[PDB]
Paper text:
Tetrahymena thermophila, a classic ciliate model organism, has been shown to possess tubular mitochondrial cristae and highly divergent electron transport chain involving four transmembrane protein complexes (I–IV). The energetically favorable oxidation of NADH or succinate by the electron transport chain (ETC) complexes I-IV (CI-CIV) first establishes a cross-membrane electrochemical gradient of protons, or the proton motive force (pmf), which is then utilized by the complex V (CV) to drive the synthesis of ATP1. Here we report cryo-EM structures of its ~8 MDa megacomplex IV2 + (I + III2 + II), as well as a ~ 10.6 MDa megacomplex (IV2 + I + III2 + II)2 at lower resolution. Our findings demonstrate the structural divergence of T. thermophila ETC megacomplex in adaptation to the tubular morphology of its mitochondrial cristae.
Megacomplex (IV2 + I + III2 + II)2 defines the relative position between neighbouring half rings and maintains the proximity between CIV2 and CIII2 cytochrome c binding sites. We were also able to isolate a minor particle set corresponding to Tt-MC (IV2 + I + III2 + II)2 in a separate cryo-EM dataset using digitonin-solubilization, focused refinement of which resulted in 4.18 and 6.77 Å for its two Tt-SC IV2 + I + III2 + II parts. Although the resolution prevents building an atomic model, it is clear that the two supercomplexes belong to neighboring megacomplex half rings. At the megacomplex-megacomplex interface, Tt-SC I + III2 contact Tt-CIV2 from the adjacent megacomplex, while the two Tt-CIIs face each other directly. Although the relative position between Tt-CI and Tt-CIV2 is divergent in Tt-MC IV2 + (I + III2 + II), subunit NDUTT4 at Tt-CI’s MA toe does contact Tt-CIV2 from the neighboring megacomplex via subunit COXMC2, as revealed by Tt-MC (IV2 + I + III2 + II)2 structure. Meanwhile, the three outward-facing COXMC2 TMHs are kept in positions where they can easily contact Tt-CI’s NDUB2 and NDUTT4 of the neighboring Tt-MC IV2 + (I + III2 + II), thereby creating an additional interaction site across the two megacomplexes in Tt-MC (IV2 + I + III2 + II)2 apart from dimerization of Tt-CII’s IMS domain. In the IMM, ~160 residues on the NT of Tt-CI core subunit ND5a, previously un-resolved in individual Tt-SC I + III2, is now resolved in Tt-MC (IV2 + I + III2 + II)2 from the digitonin dataset and fits into the concave surface formed by COXTT21 and COXTT8. In Tt-MC (IV2 + I + III2 + II), a direct distance of 97 Å is measured between the two cyt c redox sites across neighboring megacomplexes, while within a single Tt-MC IV2 + (I + III2 + II)2 the distance increases to 126 and 170 Å. Although no such charged surface patch has been identified for Tt-MC IV2 + (I + III2 + II)2 and Tt-MC (IV2 + I + III2 + II), the nearest distance (~97 Å) between cyt c reduction and oxidation sites in Tt-MC (IV2 + I + III2 + II)2 is comparable to that in a mammal (85 Å), yeast (61 Å), and plant (70 Å).
Numbering used by the authors:
A (entry chain 77): 63 to 124
B (entry chain 08): 21 to 251
C (entry chain 52): 4 to 100
D (entry chain 62): 256 to 316
E (entry chain 76): 101 to 149
F (entry chain 91): 860 to 990
G (entry chain 81): 460 to 516
H (entry chain 67): 111 to 220
Write the structure that this text describes.
């Protein structure tokens, strides 16, 4: 437990500002980010038109 | 070197008493080592004190100067021991060099952290915090207490009390971490706020600022005598 | 509402405190008497200075008072140590978060 | 201002480039001949002269 | 010759140069925080190498 | 080298203290934008909504009249894509940070170098440069 | 790097033999001293050139 | 001492090179990797990093740790398997890193 | 084992530091309030308000703090009788005289301060209207007393730790 | 100003309040560890209390009331647990 | 240090070289310490300069591009404020078509 | 072990030592398993810890070599062969998973 | 946290900030006292750092020339050549100031660790070229109709030997590539496979890596 | 020099003593190694100060000559004892080289870009491969608080 | 690292080019990029903020900006 | 840089030669009090923030060299001159003059040095509001600016 460390995994942005709405959003266990940190740097294989259609047909977690 | 039972007599946990004893033992053992080293010198170089009278004639003529010189030697030995134990003596936090007192790293780090991280509560514990502590009788055991919500006894809503019960006991959020308690404390100590004095919500965590093993500061242990490897 | 001290420890402490007060009064009187007796005895047969006589008298009076107040003070100290240790442990276990 | 101590329009890092032109204060400043330094030298010389004269007067007795 | 200059000439020269020439630095720089530091003399002239 | 080769360890040398005016706000905005992961690269600028409004309309950043537009991959001509609603949704999560950064930049812009700055010569020495 | 081990022995032997003796200064002695002094610098230059980084530079 | 140094070169540089000579149908890549790793991982070439602050200054350690970690980027390097940890703070004093396993990127030390 | 000379001892036997929970095991409710107020104000006045701290410090000075110092000063001045105690026309030993005077005076000052404290502390603490008013205003609890005791012990440890290098402190 | 002696300042909260001159001068307080010395001090206090009651027979001064639990506790525990090992 | 550490110095002497330079060695050691002080001071100064240079290089690597981006953003924000003022002017021109002209 | 968290191989620990038993003496899979075991410190005893460790291992493997989105999610066999060199992102992910699985306490 | 849909993007949120009282964010920021001097220095540094171009007045446009020796800049200023127009750091003017790093390495067919013991990649280039030549000979003729060399680029498929060819080009130099290409042209005109004459393994020592049941050798485990 | 940023890094003047420029890390390390080697030889030279004076003052024929009765030498550990000084210098040189070399050697496969340098008769040729162009677009950017983004 | 020093130039021709770019950018972005031909180069506008800082004061001056807007409308007319 | 340090030292010498004024004298007294309390007599290791500790240690080293060491050197020179005169008088080596004149010279030149680099030392305290030392320095600087009617940084 003493030596357990993050090692740079899922390094999401930690807003220090008090008026940050995302903070409250980041508090929500049901909050969904735009993409997973494990896949944030993965090569995209989808087509441009398919990606545009999927992004247009997206719903907010809240 | 602190009569560890006496340290627990004042406000000190068993581990906190151990840390305070470690610091006091370091200081006292350094001073005692210096003083006792001074003792054998006078038991050995007493003739050397008399022989060094040809270079300094007044000593052979003024007897009190001999006692003054003996006291000076004792003080020099004590100060040498103190500097060997109670000085800064910063060094590299290396596993192959820690443990052996080539530096005073452990004691220096503990003292510096204690000086930097200690401040008074600057306020009185709220009655709700007193009540929460009063309701914390034996709730820290290994088995989680099955908190039963009785509407005739707990009132409110069954879920609301269950969430409140979790926040008070199961979640572990401190009474100093309660929103209502924080608001009440803000309302109360306004006079101190009239002087701009910050309010300390949590008491000074002794276990979070001192460590005889030194793991808190993350100083690697001696390579030859530690099975565990830090960091 | 607040924490309440243990019952048996409280009773023992009360008894020890009463005994200690009585022994303190008795020892003060005994020490005054011993100081007077020491002053007289030193002025009787001792060929020494008045400073030495007074120092001996004060030291002997303090020693007599301590001898009269040994058992009571020791018992009070033991009771206080046990009570304070128990109370401190309980309070630390209570306020620990 | 006479006591500006900045005779060249350059910062401490000297971000300006040579030739570094003089400043308005440096316009009036005379190197080593200012009133303050001249008065300091005058005071040193007066102190030395007063000491020597006192010593001579004591010897003249 | 053998002892004095062989252990003081280079250091004295470096001290005098840094004191009077500021390590031979060009004056028109932007900020010391983001500029290369012109170190003083490091190859000892009195040394054979 | 050796265990003691330089014979002097300059532990006094501290990390150079950064003195940018609104670096904290700018970095917070950048971190929020990175968490959002907006495909358009121009969004990194705080004034991006006022810089290229076509990004919020069609993504038509530049005129391709003379240079032909021949996209090959998804990561090609990324400046030529409108902001997707989901991305726009993620764009709302950083609005407060963007506004704070803009306010800080505006306040810095309002600053001037007046004559009262008598220590204009002694700036770097004040600005943690005498290391 | 290990080759310099024999040279140091030779320099030490020369220096030691030059001491605790009945010196009769001849023209030959000055030339031998000059040769030793010249050999002193050359060994240091060769040892410095033995460093891989310095040689590459 | 020289012969021991030579024997190490003899046992780890030439004779393995004389073992495999022609393209092989079965595990040619494995045999070549074994042969190369038998020679590319001599400790005299890698053992420096264990005590690096002796040759790397305080700020120099921070400046080089970024390149050093980036130096062993491609995992396909058996000799890199022998090099010491490039994720260590300066032994005397480290100016940048507070916690070793607290980084903002899985491949960037800061 | 002579830490009584190697460690600070003046702060121990004064300012009501001898009080502890065991004492509160026998005191009454109003007595508990008064004792808690006095001990908290003495050891850790930070937890109290500034105006109340000022008033309590003024009361403590008017009662024992200045009075114990005055009594110790009187005892030291009594001990200061005949500063040239060992003096002669042939030679007056300034070293021995100053040394004896210094050895006598501090002991007398300590004795006087201890006597004044042990005599007036019960009366001042027990029968102070301002102290009673402060106890009514505060009404510290047992948890407050425990926290204050811990803080006072930490402050005592800090005082010795602060004056650890009084000769040369480059800081490294 | 006494108010200046009440302000909470970190530098004030971390200032060495004891000079080297206090090392020797306050050294006499350590004798309290001695049982005989503590007893002598207590005897002096008791005699002073008797004289104080005798003088408190005069108006303006109240003697040591034997019904004060606080006073009794203070008198009986002023040196209850003195220990130079602590602090 | 020297002949003291050995139990038969004569033997020790021969065992090295059969030559004696002991007094030279002692005087040389004293003079060597007395001279070694100064080069130590100079090397300390030089090492401090080198460490400062390394720190400056690291900081420029870390803060340079960030400062440049911040300056660009400041210029863009000033331009945005000016553009907002010009847009207010254009709105006035829309409300005052030719009156402003 | 430049990417590992231990100064020496003997300082690697039993988990890292198990890495030596995992692959042959001629594969960087030893270093990969050492990195995986380092990623698993203080998370093996927790289920959510194991999940987050799998995510971290996937992230590290993706950072090492460029692979398509979700490609590592199509590994036919998570089992590893002793002769598996770190040639592919799938191999890297498998080695990291094995290193996480080998971390006790 | 008051509304249930807090954090959901407002509908039709133009994200415009026209006429916003910045005093609200004053409590959200802290400004150094030396802000004026810091801003002036930052502006000067931006003017003197990124501006690697010179505004020619004759064309009334910023122009640039390739980097040259400082003396050539100073002592040979009047003879400027190769002057071009300023294109800008980005087509849209975005800022490119950022610390640079290393992108993830591409998958490799020929492992560099096979012959990494040599500082010169001669044998490595040879082995990579042999592998690429085998792949090309396998997939030579179908490039024009079944690879990227097809006409309908909508159906273009990356050549199956693209990775090997790129790895070989990285391994070998220009002259080595030319010599290997000539040898490959000869071998392709021959259309002779290496296996069409392979006999070396018949005289090779037996190895545990050459057991009969190859699949039985790899003991897979997790 | 591109603009006001004077890219000229050497700028060495005539009759220079040391290296051309200390702008390179290798150059800084070499200078530090040389200075340190010059620093820690003191005692050695000290003996040289004492040996010369004694020989030139109490070893001549007219000043304290010595009758050397030395039939044979009987040294056994002299060479190994004196070899510590060469061993220390060798160790220092090897450590410095291994420190310098480890940062500029055996790191080819982990390269951000690639360029071919072909030296021809009286000329040099710099060849840039096509893939490098793609690598130009694939450079990660450390934006924000050490956050790496790939476009 | 070693960057020299050169203050803002404020050259008449460069200032004219920057002012033309700024006016075009204002006219275009005032329509929120909903114009006929995107002729503005934002990076160039950045130079306007640093190469003609004196003229920037006119941009920071309200009455001066109003007069400039009137002149620009007249020119566009 | 080194040029900046040389310029600062020369400007400080020139200013000390020009004069110390009255408002400037009061500001110097306040700055000296602040430096003595929060820096010179306060151990830099006690500060909460490690960065604050580093900056305070840098300032403390500057004070130890620029003020303490310089004053010690001046006092030592004065002591050497006085001891030379005394030894010339008695034709023998005395012992008291060295320490006595060293202490006197350290006491004397201690303020004068503190009088010259009063501003420069203050310039090493501008850590920022993020540090408690920074906040206190900002308050002190605001008071000095109000006194002097000039905007410092
Ligand atoms: C007779 C001539 C001679 C001698 C004796 C030597 C002796 C040595 N040489 Fe060399 N060398 C050459 C002639 C010689 N050399 C020539 C002609 C070349 C170039 C070939 C060409 O053109 O390429 C060359 C090239 C050469 C190079 C490479 C240059 C190049 O790249 O080509 C190197 C580097 O490793 C080297 C090293 C050495 C070493 C380490 C010794 C060692 O033997 C000497 C080191 C011994 C000592 C160190 C002992 C001295 C004793 C001391 C105690 C010194 C310490 C004293 C102080 C510090 C005061 N020599």
């Amino acid at each position: 437990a003493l030596n357990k460390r993050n090692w740079g995994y899922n390094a999401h942005y930690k807003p220090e500002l008090e008026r940050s709405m995302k903070k409250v959003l980041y508090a929500d266990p049901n909050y969904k980010f735009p993409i997973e940190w494990p896949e944030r740097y993965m090569a995209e294989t989808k087509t441009l038109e398919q990606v545009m259609d999927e992004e247009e047909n997206w719903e907010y977690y809240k | 070197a602190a009569r560890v039972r006496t340290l627990i007599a004042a406000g000190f946990s068993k581990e906190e008493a151990e840390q305070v004893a470690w610091l006091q033992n370091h200081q006292v053992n350094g001073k005692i080592l210096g003083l006792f080293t001074g003792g054998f010198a006078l038991y050995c170089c007493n003739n050397y004190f008399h022989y060094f009278e040809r270079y300094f004639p007044r000593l052979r003529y003024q007897p009190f100067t001999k006692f003054l010189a003996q006291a000076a030697t004792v003080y020099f030995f004590f100060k040498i021991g103190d500097y060997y134990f109670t000085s800064r003596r910063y060094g590299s936090n290396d596993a192959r060099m820690n443990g052996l007192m080539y530096s005073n790293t452990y004691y220096s780090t503990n003292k510096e952290a204690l000086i930097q991280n200690f401040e008074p509560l600057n306020r009185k514990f709220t009655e709700e915090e007193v009540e929460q502590f009063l309701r914390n009788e034996g709730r820290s055991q290994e088995e989680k207490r099955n908190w039963i919500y009785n509407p005739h006894i707990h009132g409110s809503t069954e879920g609301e009390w269950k969430a409140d019960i979790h926040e008070k006991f199961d979640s572990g959020k401190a009474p100093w971490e309660r929103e209502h308690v924080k608001a009440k404390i803000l309302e109360t100590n306004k006079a101190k706020i009239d002087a701009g004095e910050e309010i300390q919500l949590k008491p000074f965590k002794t276990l979070n600022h001192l460590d005889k093993t030194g793991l808190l500061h993350r100083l690697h242990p001696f390579i030859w005598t530690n099975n565990w490897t830090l960091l | 509402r607040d924490f309440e001290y243990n019952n048996q420890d409280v009773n023992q402490l009360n008894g020890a405190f009463i005994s200690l007060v009585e022994d303190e009064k008795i020892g003060f009187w005994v020490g005054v008497g011993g100081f007077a007796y020491s002053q007289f005895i030193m002025r009787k047969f001792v060929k020494s200075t008045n400073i030495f006589a007074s120092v001996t008298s004060l030291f002997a009076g303090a020693a007599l008072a301590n001898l009269y107040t040994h058992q009571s003070r020791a018992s009070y100290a033991r009771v206080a140590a046990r009570a304070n240790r128990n109370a401190s442990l309980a309070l630390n276990k209570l306020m620990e978060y | 201002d006479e006591r500006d101590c900045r005779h060249i329009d350059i910062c401490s890092d000297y971000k300006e480039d040579y030739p570094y032109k003089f400043t308005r204060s440096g316009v009036l400043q005379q190197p080593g001949q200012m009133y303050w330094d001249l008065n300091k030298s005058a005071s040193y010389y007066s102190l030395l002269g007063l000491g020597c004269s006192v010593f001579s007067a004591l010897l003249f007795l | 010759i053998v002892l004095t200059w062989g252990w003081s000439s280079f250091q004295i020269g470096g001290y005098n140069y840094e004191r009077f020439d500021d390590n031979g630095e060009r004056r028109n720089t932007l900020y010391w925080k983001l500029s290369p530091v012109e170190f003083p003399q490091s190859k000892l002239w009195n040394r054979p190498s | 080298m050796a265990l003691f080769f330089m014979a002097n360890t300059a532990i006094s040398v501290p990390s150079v203290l950064d003195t940018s005016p609104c670096m904290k706000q700018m970095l917070a905005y950048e971190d929020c934008v990175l968490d959002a992961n907006v495909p358009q690269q121009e969004v990194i600028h705080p004034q991006w909504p006022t810089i290229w409004p076509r990004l919020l309309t069609d993504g038509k950043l530049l005129e391709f009249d003379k240079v032909p537009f021949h996209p090959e991959n998804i990561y090609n001509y990324t400046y030529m894509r409108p902001l997707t609603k989901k991305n726009k949704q993620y764009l709302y999560e950083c609005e407060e940070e963007r506004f704070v950064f803009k306010a800080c930049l505006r306040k810095v812009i309002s600053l001037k170098k007046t004559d009262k700055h008598t220590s204009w010569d002694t700036a770097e020495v004040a600005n943690l440069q005498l290391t | 790097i290990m080759i310099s081990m024999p040279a140091t022995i030779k320099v030490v032997n020369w220096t030691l033999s030059l001491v605790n003796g009945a010196l009769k200064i001849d023209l030959p002695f000055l030339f031998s001293m000059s040769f030793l002094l010249l050999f002193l610098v050359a060994g240091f230059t060769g040892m410095w050139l033995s460093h891989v980084s310095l040689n590459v530079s | 001492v020289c012969g021991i140094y030579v024997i190490h070169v003899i046992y780890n540089y030439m004779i393995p090179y004389y073992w495999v000579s022609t393209p092989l149908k079965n595990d040619e890549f494995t045999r070549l990797r074994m042969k190369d790793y038998i020679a590319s991982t001599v400790l005299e070439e890698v053992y420096g990093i264990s005590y690096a602050e002796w040759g790397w200054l305080p700020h120099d350690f921070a400046y080089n740790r970024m390149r050093g970690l980036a130096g062993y980027m491609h995992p396909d390097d058996p000799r890199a398997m022998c090099t010491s940890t490039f994720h260590r703070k300066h032994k005397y004093i480290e100016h940048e890193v507070e916690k070793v396993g607290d980084y903002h990127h899985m491949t960037y030390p800061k | 084992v002579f830490e009584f000379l190697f460690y600070n001892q003046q702060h121990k036997t004064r300012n009501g530091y001898f009080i502890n929970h065991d004492n509160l095991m026998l005191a009454s409710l109003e007595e508990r309030k008064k004792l808690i107020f006095y001990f908290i104000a003495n050891q850790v006045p930070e937890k109290l308000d500034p105006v109340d701290r000022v008033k309590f410090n003024e009361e403590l000075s008017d009662n024992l703090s200045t009075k114990a110092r005055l009594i110790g000063s009187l005892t030291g001045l009594i001990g200061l009788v005949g500063f040239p105690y060992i003096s002669t026309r042939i030679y007056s030993r300034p070293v021995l005289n100053i040394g004896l005077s210094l050895l006598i005076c501090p002991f007398l000052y300590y004795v006087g301060n201890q006597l004044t404290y042990s005599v007036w502390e019960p009366k001042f603490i027990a029968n102070n209207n301002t102290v009673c008013e402060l106890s009514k205003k505060y009404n510290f609890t047992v948890f407050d007393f425990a926290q204050a005791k811990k803080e006072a012990h930490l402050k005592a440890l800090r005082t010795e730790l602060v004056s650890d290098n009084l000769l040369y402190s480059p800081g490294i | 100003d006494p108010f200046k002696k009440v302000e909470r300042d970190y530098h004030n909260e971390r200032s060495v309040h004891k000079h080297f001159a206090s090392y020797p001068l306050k050294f006499w307080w350590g004798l309290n560890k001695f049982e005989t010395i503590q007893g002598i001090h207590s005897i002096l206090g008791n005699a002073a209390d008797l004289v104080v009651s005798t003088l408190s027979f005069i108006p303006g001064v109240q003697g040591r009331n034997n019904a004060s639990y606080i006073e009794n506790s203070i008198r009986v525990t002023r040196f209850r647990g003195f220990d130079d090992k602590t602090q | 240090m020297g002949s003291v550490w050995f139990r038969n110095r004569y033997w020790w002497y021969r065992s090295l070289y059969d030559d004696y330079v002991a007094r030279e060695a002692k005087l040389a050691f004293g003079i060597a310490a007395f001279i070694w002080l100064p080069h130590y001071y100079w090397g300390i100064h030089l090492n401090r300069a080198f460490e400062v240079n390394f720190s400056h290089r690291n900081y420029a690597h870390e803060w340079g591009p960030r400062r440049n981006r911040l300056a660009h953003s400041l210029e863009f924000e000033q331009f945005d404020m000016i553009l907002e003022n010009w847009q207010d002017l254009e709105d006035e021109y829309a409300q005052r078509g030719d009156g402003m002209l | 072990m430049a990417q590992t968290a231990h100064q020496n191989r003997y300082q690697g620990g039993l988990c890292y030592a198990q890495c030596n038993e995992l692959f042959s003496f001629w594969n960087p899979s030893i270093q990969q398993c050492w990195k995986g075991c380092d990623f698993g410190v203080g998370r093996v005893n927790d289920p959510e810890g194991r999940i987050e460790a799998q995510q971290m291992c996937k992230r590290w493997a993706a950072e090492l070599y460029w692979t398509y989105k979700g490609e590592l999610d199509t590994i036919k066999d998570l089992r590893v062969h002793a002769d598996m060199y770190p040639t592919t992102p799938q191999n890297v992910y498998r080695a990291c998973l094995a290193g996480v699985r080998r971390q006790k306490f | 946290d008051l509304p249930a849909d807090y954090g959901k993007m407002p509908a039709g949120y133009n994200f415009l900030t026209r006429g916003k009282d910045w005093r609200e964010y004053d409590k959200d920021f802290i400004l150094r006292t030396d802000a004026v001097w810091e801003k002036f220095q930052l502006e000067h540094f931006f003017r003197n750092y990124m501006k690697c171009f010179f505004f020619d007045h004759g064309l009334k446009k910023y122009q640039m020339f390739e980097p040259e020796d400082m003396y050539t800049v100073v002592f040979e200023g009047w003879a400027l050549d190769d002057l071009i127009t300023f294109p800008g750091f980005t087509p849209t003017g975005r800022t490119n100031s950022y610390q640079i790093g290393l992108s993830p390495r591409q998958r490799t067919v020929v492992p560099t660790q096979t012959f990494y013991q040599m500082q010169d990649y001669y044998m490595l280039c040879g082995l990579r070229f042999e592998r690429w030549f085998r792949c090309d000979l396998v997939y030579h003729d179908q490039r024009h109709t079944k690879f990227d060399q097809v006409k309908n680029q909508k159906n273009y498929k990356t050549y199956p030997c693209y990775r090997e060819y790129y790895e070989a080009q990285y391994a070998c130099q220009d002259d080595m590539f030319d010599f290997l290409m000539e040898l490959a042209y000869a071998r392709r005109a021959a259309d002779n496979f290496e296996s069409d004459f392979a006999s070396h393994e018949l005289t090779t020592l037996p190895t545990f890596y050459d057991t009969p049941k190859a699949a039985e050798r790899k003991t897979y485990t997790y | 020099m591109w603009g006001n940023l004077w890219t000229e890094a050497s700028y060495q003047l005539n009759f220079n003593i040391g290296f051309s420029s200390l702008r390179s890390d290798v150059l800084i390390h070499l200078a530090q190694w040389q200075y340190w080697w010059w620093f820690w030889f003191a005692l050695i030279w000290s003996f040289y100060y004492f040996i010369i004076l004694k020989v030139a003052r109490f070893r001549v024929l007219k000043m304290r000559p010595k009758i050397s009765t030395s039939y044979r030498p009987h040294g056994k550990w002299g060479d190994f004892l004196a070899c510590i000084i060469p061993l220390i210098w060798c160790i220092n040189i090897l450590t410095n080289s291994n420190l310098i070399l480890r940062l500029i050697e055996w790191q080819n496969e982990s390269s951000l870009f690639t360029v071919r340098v072909r030296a021809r008769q009286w000329y040099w040729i710099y060849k840039f491969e096509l893939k490098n162009f793609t690598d130009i677009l694939s450079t990660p950017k450390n934006i924000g608080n050490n956050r790496w983004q790939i476009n | 690292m070693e960057v020299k020093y050169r203050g803002p130039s404020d050259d008449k021709l460069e200032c004219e080019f920057l002012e033309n770019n700024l006016l075009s950018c204002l006219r275009e972005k005032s329509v929120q990029d909903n114009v006929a031909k995107m002729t503005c180069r934002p990076e160039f506008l950045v130079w306007f903020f640093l190469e003609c800082p004196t003229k920037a004061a006119v941009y920071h001056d309200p009455k001066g900006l109003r007069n400039i807007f009137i002149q620009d409308k007249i020119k566009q007319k | 840089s080194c040029t900046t340090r040389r310029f600062i030292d020369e400007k400080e010498k020139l200013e000390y030669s020009r004069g110390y004024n009255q408002q400037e004298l009061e500001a110097s007294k306040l700055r000296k009090d602040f430096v003595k309390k929060y820096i010179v007599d306060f151990d830099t290791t006690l500060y909460k923030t490690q960065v604050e500790r580093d900056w305070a240690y840098i300032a403390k080293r500057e004070y130890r060299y620029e003020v303490q060491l310089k004053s010690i050197g001046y006092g030592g020179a004065l002591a050497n001159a006085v001891l030379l005169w005394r030894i010339y008088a008695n034709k023998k080596m005395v012992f008291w003059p060295i320490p006595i004149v060293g202490a006197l010279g350290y006491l004397y030149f201690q303020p004068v040095f503190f009088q010259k680099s009063n501003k420069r030392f203050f310039d090493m305290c501008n850590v920022g509001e993020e540090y408690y030392l920074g906040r206190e320095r900002n308050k002190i600087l605001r008071e000095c600016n109000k006194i002097l009617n000039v905007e410092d940084f």
